[PDB]
Amino acid sequence: EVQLVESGGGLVQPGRSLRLSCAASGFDIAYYSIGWVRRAPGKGEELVARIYPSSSSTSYADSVKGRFTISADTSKNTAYLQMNSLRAEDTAVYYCARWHYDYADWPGGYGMDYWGQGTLVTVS
């Protein structure tokens, strides 16, 4: 009954922008931490961005700060990753993730409990 359904990926040129969407079902997004993880061949895997329900503050990986913005629309029960100034090294499969309540405001990758299906973003 808990579902995270992603959309918004694609293939674009360097310098352009994309907005990933993560439509949540089965819980109220205003009370849960949402984040984005990415993976790619020959790379590792990395936490990109996270939003915390305590103060709606955000945190970002060093390589994307100032270019990516994570946010949530409580009215639509959806989180977004706004990806501006895309770079070749941003090519990856991106996943939306939810954290368990027990770790909602605890920073790090520990505590995730649901994930989206994966969305490919490619910079040409």
PDB file of all heavy atoms in Angstrom, residues 3-8 19-25 27-30 32-36 49-51 69-82 95-98:
ATOM      1  N   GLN A   3       3.655   3.168  -1.749  1.00  0.00           N
ATOM      2  CA  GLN A   3       4.200   3.177  -3.098  1.00  0.00           C
ATOM      3  C   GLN A   3       4.915   4.493  -3.359  1.00  0.00           C
ATOM      4  O   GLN A   3       4.465   5.556  -2.917  1.00  0.00           O
ATOM      5  CB  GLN A   3       3.092   2.979  -4.139  1.00  0.00           C
ATOM      6  CG  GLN A   3       2.642   1.547  -4.306  1.00  0.00           C
ATOM      7  CD  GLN A   3       3.399   0.829  -5.417  1.00  0.00           C
ATOM      8  OE1 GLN A   3       4.170  -0.099  -5.156  1.00  0.00           O
ATOM      9  NE2 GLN A   3       3.185   1.260  -6.662  1.00  0.00           N
ATOM     10  N   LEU A   4       6.029   4.421  -4.082  1.00  0.00           N
ATOM     11  CA  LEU A   4       6.715   5.609  -4.585  1.00  0.00           C
ATOM     12  C   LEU A   4       6.861   5.416  -6.083  1.00  0.00           C
ATOM     13  O   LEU A   4       7.561   4.498  -6.515  1.00  0.00           O
ATOM     14  CB  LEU A   4       8.082   5.793  -3.939  1.00  0.00           C
ATOM     15  CG  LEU A   4       8.177   5.878  -2.418  1.00  0.00           C
ATOM     16  CD1 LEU A   4       9.625   5.730  -2.004  1.00  0.00           C
ATOM     17  CD2 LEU A   4       7.582   7.196  -1.902  1.00  0.00           C
ATOM     18  N   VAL A   5       6.188   6.253  -6.863  1.00  0.00           N
ATOM     19  CA  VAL A   5       6.151   6.122  -8.316  1.00  0.00           C
ATOM     20  C   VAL A   5       6.859   7.330  -8.910  1.00  0.00           C
ATOM     21  O   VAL A   5       6.432   8.475  -8.712  1.00  0.00           O
ATOM     22  CB  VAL A   5       4.713   5.999  -8.840  1.00  0.00           C
ATOM     23  CG1 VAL A   5       4.718   5.728 -10.331  1.00  0.00           C
ATOM     24  CG2 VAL A   5       3.956   4.899  -8.090  1.00  0.00           C
ATOM     25  N   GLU A   6       7.956   7.077  -9.613  1.00  0.00           N
ATOM     26  CA  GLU A   6       8.781   8.136 -10.161  1.00  0.00           C
ATOM     27  C   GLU A   6       8.400   8.461 -11.600  1.00  0.00           C
ATOM     28  O   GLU A   6       7.854   7.626 -12.332  1.00  0.00           O
ATOM     29  CB  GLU A   6      10.261   7.755 -10.110  1.00  0.00           C
ATOM     30  CG  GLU A   6      10.756   7.311  -8.758  1.00  0.00           C
ATOM     31  CD  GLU A   6      11.960   6.418  -8.892  1.00  0.00           C
ATOM     32  OE1 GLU A   6      12.389   6.194 -10.046  1.00  0.00           O
ATOM     33  OE2 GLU A   6      12.484   5.954  -7.867  1.00  0.00           O
ATOM     34  N   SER A   7       8.708   9.694 -11.997  1.00  0.00           N
ATOM     35  CA  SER A   7       8.611  10.114 -13.388  1.00  0.00           C
ATOM     36  C   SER A   7       9.578  11.271 -13.619  1.00  0.00           C
ATOM     37  O   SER A   7      10.177  11.801 -12.678  1.00  0.00           O
ATOM     38  CB  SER A   7       7.171  10.501 -13.746  1.00  0.00           C
ATOM     39  OG  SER A   7       6.719  11.573 -12.930  1.00  0.00           O
ATOM     40  N   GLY A   8       9.752  11.643 -14.893  1.00  0.00           N
ATOM     41  CA  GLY A   8      10.430  12.874 -15.255  1.00  0.00           C
ATOM     42  C   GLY A   8      11.846  12.764 -15.787  1.00  0.00           C
ATOM     43  O   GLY A   8      12.486  13.805 -16.019  1.00  0.00           O
ATOM     44  N   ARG A  19      13.239  17.764 -14.125  1.00  0.00           N
ATOM     45  CA  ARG A  19      12.613  17.664 -12.813  1.00  0.00           C
ATOM     46  C   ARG A  19      12.113  16.245 -12.626  1.00  0.00           C
ATOM     47  O   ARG A  19      11.171  15.820 -13.299  1.00  0.00           O
ATOM     48  CB  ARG A  19      11.461  18.654 -12.639  1.00  0.00           C
ATOM     49  CG  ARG A  19      10.949  18.682 -11.199  1.00  0.00           C
ATOM     50  CD  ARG A  19       9.697  19.546 -11.047  1.00  0.00           C
ATOM     51  NE  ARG A  19       8.536  18.891 -11.642  1.00  0.00           N
ATOM     52  CZ  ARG A  19       7.289  19.340 -11.537  1.00  0.00           C
ATOM     53  NH1 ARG A  19       7.039  20.447 -10.852  1.00  0.00           N
ATOM     54  NH2 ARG A  19       6.294  18.672 -12.109  1.00  0.00           N
ATOM     55  N   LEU A  20      12.723  15.515 -11.699  1.00  0.00           N
ATOM     56  CA  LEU A  20      12.175  14.221 -11.324  1.00  0.00           C
ATOM     57  C   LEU A  20      11.035  14.399 -10.328  1.00  0.00           C
ATOM     58  O   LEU A  20      11.077  15.290  -9.474  1.00  0.00           O
ATOM     59  CB  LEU A  20      13.263  13.330 -10.722  1.00  0.00           C
ATOM     60  CG  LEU A  20      14.561  13.188 -11.519  1.00  0.00           C
ATOM     61  CD1 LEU A  20      15.396  12.080 -10.900  1.00  0.00           C
ATOM     62  CD2 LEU A  20      14.309  12.895 -13.001  1.00  0.00           C
ATOM     63  N   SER A  21      10.010  13.556 -10.459  1.00  0.00           N
ATOM     64  CA  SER A  21       8.872  13.509  -9.551  1.00  0.00           C
ATOM     65  C   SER A  21       8.804  12.158  -8.860  1.00  0.00           C
ATOM     66  O   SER A  21       9.132  11.120  -9.442  1.00  0.00           O
ATOM     67  CB  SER A  21       7.540  13.741 -10.282  1.00  0.00           C
ATOM     68  OG  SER A  21       7.381  15.099 -10.618  1.00  0.00           O
ATOM     69  N   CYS A  22       8.342  12.179  -7.618  1.00  0.00           N
ATOM     70  CA  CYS A  22       8.165  10.983  -6.801  1.00  0.00           C
ATOM     71  C   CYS A  22       6.781  11.070  -6.164  1.00  0.00           C
ATOM     72  O   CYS A  22       6.613  11.731  -5.136  1.00  0.00           O
ATOM     73  CB  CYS A  22       9.248  10.888  -5.742  1.00  0.00           C
ATOM     74  SG  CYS A  22       9.142   9.444  -4.701  1.00  0.00           S
ATOM     75  N   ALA A  23       5.802  10.391  -6.759  1.00  0.00           N
ATOM     76  CA  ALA A  23       4.425  10.443  -6.270  1.00  0.00           C
ATOM     77  C   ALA A  23       4.230   9.401  -5.176  1.00  0.00           C
ATOM     78  O   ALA A  23       4.345   8.199  -5.429  1.00  0.00           O
ATOM     79  CB  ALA A  23       3.432  10.214  -7.408  1.00  0.00           C
ATOM     80  N   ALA A  24       3.931   9.850  -3.963  1.00  0.00           N
ATOM     81  CA  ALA A  24       3.808   8.945  -2.829  1.00  0.00           C
ATOM     82  C   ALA A  24       2.374   8.478  -2.634  1.00  0.00           C
ATOM     83  O   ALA A  24       1.431   9.262  -2.778  1.00  0.00           O
ATOM     84  CB  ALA A  24       4.294   9.628  -1.551  1.00  0.00           C
ATOM     85  N   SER A  25       2.220   7.202  -2.275  1.00  0.00           N
ATOM     86  CA  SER A  25       0.933   6.624  -1.906  1.00  0.00           C
ATOM     87  C   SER A  25       1.068   5.888  -0.582  1.00  0.00           C
ATOM     88  O   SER A  25       2.111   5.286  -0.302  1.00  0.00           O
ATOM     89  CB  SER A  25       0.416   5.646  -2.974  1.00  0.00           C
ATOM     90  OG  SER A  25       0.070   6.334  -4.154  1.00  0.00           O
ATOM     91  N   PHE A  27       0.939   7.054   2.590  1.00  0.00           N
ATOM     92  CA  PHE A  27       1.452   7.804   3.730  1.00  0.00           C
ATOM     93  C   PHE A  27       1.418   9.282   3.381  1.00  0.00           C
ATOM     94  O   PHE A  27       1.324   9.657   2.214  1.00  0.00           O
ATOM     95  CB  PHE A  27       2.872   7.376   4.120  1.00  0.00           C
ATOM     96  CG  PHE A  27       3.922   7.712   3.089  1.00  0.00           C
ATOM     97  CD1 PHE A  27       4.697   8.855   3.217  1.00  0.00           C
ATOM     98  CD2 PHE A  27       4.154   6.865   2.010  1.00  0.00           C
ATOM     99  CE1 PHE A  27       5.669   9.171   2.271  1.00  0.00           C
ATOM    100  CE2 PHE A  27       5.139   7.169   1.060  1.00  0.00           C
ATOM    101  CZ  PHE A  27       5.892   8.314   1.189  1.00  0.00           C
ATOM    102  N   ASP A  28       1.495  10.112   4.415  1.00  0.00           N
ATOM    103  CA  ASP A  28       1.458  11.561   4.263  1.00  0.00           C
ATOM    104  C   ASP A  28       2.891  12.057   4.116  1.00  0.00           C
ATOM    105  O   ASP A  28       3.689  11.934   5.051  1.00  0.00           O
ATOM    106  CB  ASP A  28       0.771  12.191   5.478  1.00  0.00           C
ATOM    107  CG  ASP A  28       0.577  13.692   5.352  1.00  0.00           C
ATOM    108  OD1 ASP A  28       1.243  14.346   4.515  1.00  0.00           O
ATOM    109  OD2 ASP A  28      -0.256  14.228   6.123  1.00  0.00           O
ATOM    110  N   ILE A  29       3.216  12.623   2.950  1.00  0.00           N
ATOM    111  CA  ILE A  29       4.611  12.949   2.665  1.00  0.00           C
ATOM    112  C   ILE A  29       5.138  14.030   3.596  1.00  0.00           C
ATOM    113  O   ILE A  29       6.343  14.091   3.844  1.00  0.00           O
ATOM    114  CB  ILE A  29       4.786  13.339   1.183  1.00  0.00           C
ATOM    115  CG1 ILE A  29       6.251  13.195   0.771  1.00  0.00           C
ATOM    116  CG2 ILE A  29       4.292  14.759   0.915  1.00  0.00           C
ATOM    117  CD1 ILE A  29       6.474  13.371  -0.698  1.00  0.00           C
ATOM    118  N   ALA A  30       4.261  14.855   4.171  1.00  0.00           N
ATOM    119  CA  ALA A  30       4.722  15.915   5.063  1.00  0.00           C
ATOM    120  C   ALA A  30       5.391  15.375   6.324  1.00  0.00           C
ATOM    121  O   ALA A  30       6.125  16.120   6.982  1.00  0.00           O
ATOM    122  CB  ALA A  30       3.550  16.821   5.447  1.00  0.00           C
ATOM    123  N   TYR A  32       7.297  12.390   6.449  1.00  0.00           N
ATOM    124  CA  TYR A  32       8.324  11.403   6.150  1.00  0.00           C
ATOM    125  C   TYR A  32       9.484  12.052   5.414  1.00  0.00           C
ATOM    126  O   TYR A  32       9.306  13.002   4.648  1.00  0.00           O
ATOM    127  CB  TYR A  32       7.755  10.244   5.330  1.00  0.00           C
ATOM    128  CG  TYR A  32       7.028   9.247   6.194  1.00  0.00           C
ATOM    129  CD1 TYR A  32       5.710   9.472   6.585  1.00  0.00           C
ATOM    130  CD2 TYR A  32       7.672   8.108   6.671  1.00  0.00           C
ATOM    131  CE1 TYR A  32       5.045   8.576   7.391  1.00  0.00           C
ATOM    132  CE2 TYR A  32       7.009   7.198   7.473  1.00  0.00           C
ATOM    133  CZ  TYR A  32       5.695   7.442   7.836  1.00  0.00           C
ATOM    134  OH  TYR A  32       5.032   6.549   8.649  1.00  0.00           O
ATOM    135  N   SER A  33      10.684  11.549   5.681  1.00  0.00           N
ATOM    136  CA  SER A  33      11.852  12.005   4.949  1.00  0.00           C
ATOM    137  C   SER A  33      11.897  11.315   3.593  1.00  0.00           C
ATOM    138  O   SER A  33      11.696  10.099   3.507  1.00  0.00           O
ATOM    139  CB  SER A  33      13.135  11.717   5.720  1.00  0.00           C
ATOM    140  OG  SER A  33      14.237  12.189   4.975  1.00  0.00           O
ATOM    141  N   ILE A  34      12.136  12.101   2.541  1.00  0.00           N
ATOM    142  CA  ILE A  34      12.283  11.602   1.174  1.00  0.00           C
ATOM    143  C   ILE A  34      13.671  11.981   0.673  1.00  0.00           C
ATOM    144  O   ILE A  34      14.206  13.034   1.035  1.00  0.00           O
ATOM    145  CB  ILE A  34      11.186  12.171   0.252  1.00  0.00           C
ATOM    146  CG1 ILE A  34       9.799  11.762   0.756  1.00  0.00           C
ATOM    147  CG2 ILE A  34      11.382  11.702  -1.193  1.00  0.00           C
ATOM    148  CD1 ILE A  34       9.537  10.284   0.700  1.00  0.00           C
ATOM    149  N   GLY A  35      14.281  11.099  -0.124  1.00  0.00           N
ATOM    150  CA  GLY A  35      15.585  11.394  -0.677  1.00  0.00           C
ATOM    151  C   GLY A  35      15.728  10.767  -2.046  1.00  0.00           C
ATOM    152  O   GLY A  35      14.854  10.035  -2.512  1.00  0.00           O
ATOM    153  N   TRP A  36      16.846  11.073  -2.691  1.00  0.00           N
ATOM    154  CA  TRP A  36      17.166  10.526  -4.007  1.00  0.00           C
ATOM    155  C   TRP A  36      18.552   9.904  -3.969  1.00  0.00           C
ATOM    156  O   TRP A  36      19.500  10.508  -3.444  1.00  0.00           O
ATOM    157  CB  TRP A  36      17.096  11.615  -5.087  1.00  0.00           C
ATOM    158  CG  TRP A  36      15.730  12.172  -5.282  1.00  0.00           C
ATOM    159  CD1 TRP A  36      15.153  13.225  -4.607  1.00  0.00           C
ATOM    160  CD2 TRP A  36      14.757  11.714  -6.215  1.00  0.00           C
ATOM    161  NE1 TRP A  36      13.877  13.443  -5.072  1.00  0.00           N
ATOM    162  CE2 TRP A  36      13.612  12.531  -6.066  1.00  0.00           C
ATOM    163  CE3 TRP A  36      14.747  10.698  -7.178  1.00  0.00           C
ATOM    164  CZ2 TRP A  36      12.468  12.358  -6.835  1.00  0.00           C
ATOM    165  CZ3 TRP A  36      13.609  10.525  -7.934  1.00  0.00           C
ATOM    166  CH2 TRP A  36      12.480  11.348  -7.760  1.00  0.00           C
ATOM    167  N   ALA A  49      20.414  13.719  -2.417  1.00  0.00           N
ATOM    168  CA  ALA A  49      19.662  14.797  -1.791  1.00  0.00           C
ATOM    169  C   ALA A  49      18.660  14.182  -0.835  1.00  0.00           C
ATOM    170  O   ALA A  49      18.196  13.057  -1.040  1.00  0.00           O
ATOM    171  CB  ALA A  49      18.931  15.652  -2.834  1.00  0.00           C
ATOM    172  N   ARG A  50      18.325  14.928   0.217  1.00  0.00           N
ATOM    173  CA  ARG A  50      17.389  14.428   1.210  1.00  0.00           C
ATOM    174  C   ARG A  50      16.645  15.613   1.804  1.00  0.00           C
ATOM    175  O   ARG A  50      17.233  16.680   1.972  1.00  0.00           O
ATOM    176  CB  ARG A  50      18.117  13.658   2.315  1.00  0.00           C
ATOM    177  CG  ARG A  50      17.167  13.006   3.280  1.00  0.00           C
ATOM    178  CD  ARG A  50      17.806  11.829   4.010  1.00  0.00           C
ATOM    179  NE  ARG A  50      16.977  11.515   5.156  1.00  0.00           N
ATOM    180  CZ  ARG A  50      17.407  10.951   6.277  1.00  0.00           C
ATOM    181  NH1 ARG A  50      18.684  10.601   6.420  1.00  0.00           N
ATOM    182  NH2 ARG A  50      16.538  10.765   7.264  1.00  0.00           N
ATOM    183  N   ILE A  51      15.353  15.437   2.079  1.00  0.00           N
ATOM    184  CA  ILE A  51      14.560  16.444   2.776  1.00  0.00           C
ATOM    185  C   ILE A  51      14.032  15.847   4.078  1.00  0.00           C
ATOM    186  O   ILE A  51      13.610  14.683   4.122  1.00  0.00           O
ATOM    187  CB  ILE A  51      13.411  16.996   1.898  1.00  0.00           C
ATOM    188  CG1 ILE A  51      12.755  18.212   2.576  1.00  0.00           C
ATOM    189  CG2 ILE A  51      12.389  15.922   1.575  1.00  0.00           C
ATOM    190  CD1 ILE A  51      11.939  19.084   1.620  1.00  0.00           C
ATOM    191  N   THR A  69      17.877  20.699  -6.444  1.00  0.00           N
ATOM    192  CA  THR A  69      17.029  21.114  -5.336  1.00  0.00           C
ATOM    193  C   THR A  69      15.958  20.064  -5.090  1.00  0.00           C
ATOM    194  O   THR A  69      15.187  19.725  -5.995  1.00  0.00           O
ATOM    195  CB  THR A  69      16.355  22.471  -5.611  1.00  0.00           C
ATOM    196  OG1 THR A  69      17.347  23.452  -5.941  1.00  0.00           O
ATOM    197  CG2 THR A  69      15.578  22.927  -4.382  1.00  0.00           C
ATOM    198  N   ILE A  70      15.871  19.586  -3.859  1.00  0.00           N
ATOM    199  CA  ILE A  70      14.817  18.660  -3.483  1.00  0.00           C
ATOM    200  C   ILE A  70      13.736  19.440  -2.752  1.00  0.00           C
ATOM    201  O   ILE A  70      14.028  20.371  -1.983  1.00  0.00           O
ATOM    202  CB  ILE A  70      15.368  17.501  -2.631  1.00  0.00           C
ATOM    203  CG1 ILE A  70      14.285  16.455  -2.383  1.00  0.00           C
ATOM    204  CG2 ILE A  70      15.956  18.030  -1.316  1.00  0.00           C
ATOM    205  CD1 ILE A  70      14.791  15.197  -1.682  1.00  0.00           C
ATOM    206  N   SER A  71      12.483  19.084  -3.015  1.00  0.00           N
ATOM    207  CA  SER A  71      11.346  19.760  -2.409  1.00  0.00           C
ATOM    208  C   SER A  71      10.174  18.794  -2.383  1.00  0.00           C
ATOM    209  O   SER A  71      10.238  17.693  -2.939  1.00  0.00           O
ATOM    210  CB  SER A  71      10.988  21.035  -3.173  1.00  0.00           C
ATOM    211  OG  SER A  71      10.464  20.713  -4.448  1.00  0.00           O
ATOM    212  N   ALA A  72       9.094  19.218  -1.736  1.00  0.00           N
ATOM    213  CA  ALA A  72       7.888  18.409  -1.650  1.00  0.00           C
ATOM    214  C   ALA A  72       6.665  19.311  -1.719  1.00  0.00           C
ATOM    215  O   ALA A  72       6.668  20.419  -1.180  1.00  0.00           O
ATOM    216  CB  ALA A  72       7.845  17.584  -0.360  1.00  0.00           C
ATOM    217  N   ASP A  73       5.627  18.817  -2.374  1.00  0.00           N
ATOM    218  CA  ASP A  73       4.329  19.479  -2.468  1.00  0.00           C
ATOM    219  C   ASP A  73       3.353  18.625  -1.668  1.00  0.00           C
ATOM    220  O   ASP A  73       2.880  17.587  -2.143  1.00  0.00           O
ATOM    221  CB  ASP A  73       3.912  19.625  -3.929  1.00  0.00           C
ATOM    222  CG  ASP A  73       2.618  20.412  -4.115  1.00  0.00           C
ATOM    223  OD1 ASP A  73       1.697  20.303  -3.283  1.00  0.00           O
ATOM    224  OD2 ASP A  73       2.522  21.137  -5.129  1.00  0.00           O
ATOM    225  N   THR A  74       3.055  19.063  -0.444  1.00  0.00           N
ATOM    226  CA  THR A  74       2.145  18.303   0.405  1.00  0.00           C
ATOM    227  C   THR A  74       0.768  18.170  -0.224  1.00  0.00           C
ATOM    228  O   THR A  74       0.134  17.116  -0.098  1.00  0.00           O
ATOM    229  CB  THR A  74       2.056  18.957   1.780  1.00  0.00           C
ATOM    230  OG1 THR A  74       3.361  18.962   2.372  1.00  0.00           O
ATOM    231  CG2 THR A  74       1.090  18.187   2.683  1.00  0.00           C
ATOM    232  N   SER A  75       0.308  19.202  -0.940  1.00  0.00           N
ATOM    233  CA  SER A  75      -0.997  19.134  -1.588  1.00  0.00           C
ATOM    234  C   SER A  75      -1.071  17.966  -2.564  1.00  0.00           C
ATOM    235  O   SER A  75      -2.107  17.299  -2.668  1.00  0.00           O
ATOM    236  CB  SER A  75      -1.292  20.450  -2.312  1.00  0.00           C
ATOM    237  OG  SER A  75      -0.792  21.545  -1.562  1.00  0.00           O
ATOM    238  N   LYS A  76       0.019  17.698  -3.282  1.00  0.00           N
ATOM    239  CA  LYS A  76       0.051  16.625  -4.269  1.00  0.00           C
ATOM    240  C   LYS A  76       0.681  15.340  -3.742  1.00  0.00           C
ATOM    241  O   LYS A  76       0.771  14.362  -4.495  1.00  0.00           O
ATOM    242  CB  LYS A  76       0.805  17.085  -5.517  1.00  0.00           C
ATOM    243  CG  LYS A  76       0.248  18.346  -6.156  1.00  0.00           C
ATOM    244  CD  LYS A  76       1.054  18.713  -7.389  1.00  0.00           C
ATOM    245  CE  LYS A  76       0.653  20.079  -7.930  1.00  0.00           C
ATOM    246  NZ  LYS A  76      -0.789  20.116  -8.302  1.00  0.00           N
ATOM    247  N   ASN A  77       1.125  15.322  -2.484  1.00  0.00           N
ATOM    248  CA  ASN A  77       1.816  14.166  -1.900  1.00  0.00           C
ATOM    249  C   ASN A  77       2.952  13.682  -2.798  1.00  0.00           C
ATOM    250  O   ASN A  77       3.135  12.477  -3.005  1.00  0.00           O
ATOM    251  CB  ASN A  77       0.844  13.023  -1.604  1.00  0.00           C
ATOM    252  CG  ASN A  77       1.157  12.320  -0.296  1.00  0.00           C
ATOM    253  OD1 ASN A  77       1.321  12.964   0.740  1.00  0.00           O
ATOM    254  ND2 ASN A  77       1.244  10.995  -0.338  1.00  0.00           N
ATOM    255  N   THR A  78       3.729  14.629  -3.318  1.00  0.00           N
ATOM    256  CA  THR A  78       4.780  14.354  -4.289  1.00  0.00           C
ATOM    257  C   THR A  78       6.048  15.100  -3.897  1.00  0.00           C
ATOM    258  O   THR A  78       5.987  16.246  -3.442  1.00  0.00           O
ATOM    259  CB  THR A  78       4.336  14.770  -5.702  1.00  0.00           C
ATOM    260  OG1 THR A  78       3.142  14.062  -6.044  1.00  0.00           O
ATOM    261  CG2 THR A  78       5.415  14.453  -6.724  1.00  0.00           C
ATOM    262  N   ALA A  79       7.194  14.440  -4.048  1.00  0.00           N
ATOM    263  CA  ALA A  79       8.484  15.094  -3.914  1.00  0.00           C
ATOM    264  C   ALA A  79       9.113  15.276  -5.293  1.00  0.00           C
ATOM    265  O   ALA A  79       8.798  14.558  -6.246  1.00  0.00           O
ATOM    266  CB  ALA A  79       9.419  14.287  -3.004  1.00  0.00           C
ATOM    267  N   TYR A  80      10.006  16.253  -5.388  1.00  0.00           N
ATOM    268  CA  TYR A  80      10.650  16.606  -6.643  1.00  0.00           C
ATOM    269  C   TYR A  80      12.148  16.750  -6.442  1.00  0.00           C
ATOM    270  O   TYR A  80      12.621  17.172  -5.379  1.00  0.00           O
ATOM    271  CB  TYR A  80      10.095  17.918  -7.226  1.00  0.00           C
ATOM    272  CG  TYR A  80       8.601  17.954  -7.318  1.00  0.00           C
ATOM    273  CD1 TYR A  80       7.840  18.528  -6.304  1.00  0.00           C
ATOM    274  CD2 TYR A  80       7.941  17.429  -8.424  1.00  0.00           C
ATOM    275  CE1 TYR A  80       6.457  18.561  -6.386  1.00  0.00           C
ATOM    276  CE2 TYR A  80       6.561  17.456  -8.513  1.00  0.00           C
ATOM    277  CZ  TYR A  80       5.825  18.031  -7.492  1.00  0.00           C
ATOM    278  OH  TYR A  80       4.452  18.060  -7.579  1.00  0.00           O
ATOM    279  N   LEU A  81      12.893  16.396  -7.483  1.00  0.00           N
ATOM    280  CA  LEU A  81      14.307  16.722  -7.592  1.00  0.00           C
ATOM    281  C   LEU A  81      14.471  17.587  -8.829  1.00  0.00           C
ATOM    282  O   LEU A  81      14.364  17.088  -9.954  1.00  0.00           O
ATOM    283  CB  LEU A  81      15.167  15.458  -7.684  1.00  0.00           C
ATOM    284  CG  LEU A  81      16.686  15.687  -7.663  1.00  0.00           C
ATOM    285  CD1 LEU A  81      17.152  16.242  -6.300  1.00  0.00           C
ATOM    286  CD2 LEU A  81      17.413  14.399  -7.983  1.00  0.00           C
ATOM    287  N   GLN A  82      14.704  18.886  -8.624  1.00  0.00           N
ATOM    288  CA  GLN A  82      14.930  19.815  -9.727  1.00  0.00           C
ATOM    289  C   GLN A  82      16.410  19.783 -10.071  1.00  0.00           C
ATOM    290  O   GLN A  82      17.250  20.165  -9.253  1.00  0.00           O
ATOM    291  CB  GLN A  82      14.479  21.225  -9.351  1.00  0.00           C
ATOM    292  CG  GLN A  82      14.724  22.265 -10.451  1.00  0.00           C
ATOM    293  CD  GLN A  82      13.850  22.036 -11.671  1.00  0.00           C
ATOM    294  OE1 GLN A  82      12.663  21.732 -11.548  1.00  0.00           O
ATOM    295  NE2 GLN A  82      14.438  22.158 -12.849  1.00  0.00           N
ATOM    296  N   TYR A  95      16.807   6.944  -7.976  1.00  0.00           N
ATOM    297  CA  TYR A  95      15.736   6.324  -7.208  1.00  0.00           C
ATOM    298  C   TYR A  95      15.242   7.277  -6.138  1.00  0.00           C
ATOM    299  O   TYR A  95      16.051   7.880  -5.423  1.00  0.00           O
ATOM    300  CB  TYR A  95      16.217   5.035  -6.531  1.00  0.00           C
ATOM    301  CG  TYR A  95      16.593   3.954  -7.503  1.00  0.00           C
ATOM    302  CD1 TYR A  95      17.833   3.968  -8.125  1.00  0.00           C
ATOM    303  CD2 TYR A  95      15.697   2.929  -7.824  1.00  0.00           C
ATOM    304  CE1 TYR A  95      18.182   2.988  -9.037  1.00  0.00           C
ATOM    305  CE2 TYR A  95      16.052   1.932  -8.710  1.00  0.00           C
ATOM    306  CZ  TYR A  95      17.295   1.982  -9.318  1.00  0.00           C
ATOM    307  OH  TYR A  95      17.672   1.024 -10.229  1.00  0.00           O
ATOM    308  N   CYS A  96      13.923   7.399  -6.027  1.00  0.00           N
ATOM    309  CA  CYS A  96      13.305   8.014  -4.861  1.00  0.00           C
ATOM    310  C   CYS A  96      13.307   7.023  -3.698  1.00  0.00           C
ATOM    311  O   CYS A  96      13.180   5.817  -3.892  1.00  0.00           O
ATOM    312  CB  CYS A  96      11.880   8.441  -5.222  1.00  0.00           C
ATOM    313  SG  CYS A  96      11.021   9.312  -3.942  1.00  0.00           S
ATOM    314  N   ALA A  97      13.467   7.537  -2.479  1.00  0.00           N
ATOM    315  CA  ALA A  97      13.513   6.685  -1.299  1.00  0.00           C
ATOM    316  C   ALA A  97      12.791   7.366  -0.147  1.00  0.00           C
ATOM    317  O   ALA A  97      12.773   8.595  -0.052  1.00  0.00           O
ATOM    318  CB  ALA A  97      14.957   6.391  -0.882  1.00  0.00           C
ATOM    319  N   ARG A  98      12.191   6.552   0.710  1.00  0.00           N
ATOM    320  CA  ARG A  98      11.579   6.995   1.959  1.00  0.00           C
ATOM    321  C   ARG A  98      12.354   6.400   3.119  1.00  0.00           C
ATOM    322  O   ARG A  98      12.873   5.290   3.023  1.00  0.00           O
ATOM    323  CB  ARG A  98      10.116   6.549   2.038  1.00  0.00           C
ATOM    324  CG  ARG A  98       9.331   7.196   3.188  1.00  0.00           C
ATOM    325  CD  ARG A  98       8.015   6.493   3.396  1.00  0.00           C
ATOM    326  NE  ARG A  98       8.115   5.409   4.372  1.00  0.00           N
ATOM    327  CZ  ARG A  98       7.059   4.837   4.956  1.00  0.00           C
ATOM    328  NH1 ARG A  98       5.830   5.248   4.673  1.00  0.00           N
ATOM    329  NH2 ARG A  98       7.227   3.860   5.832  1.00  0.00           N
TER     330      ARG A  98
END
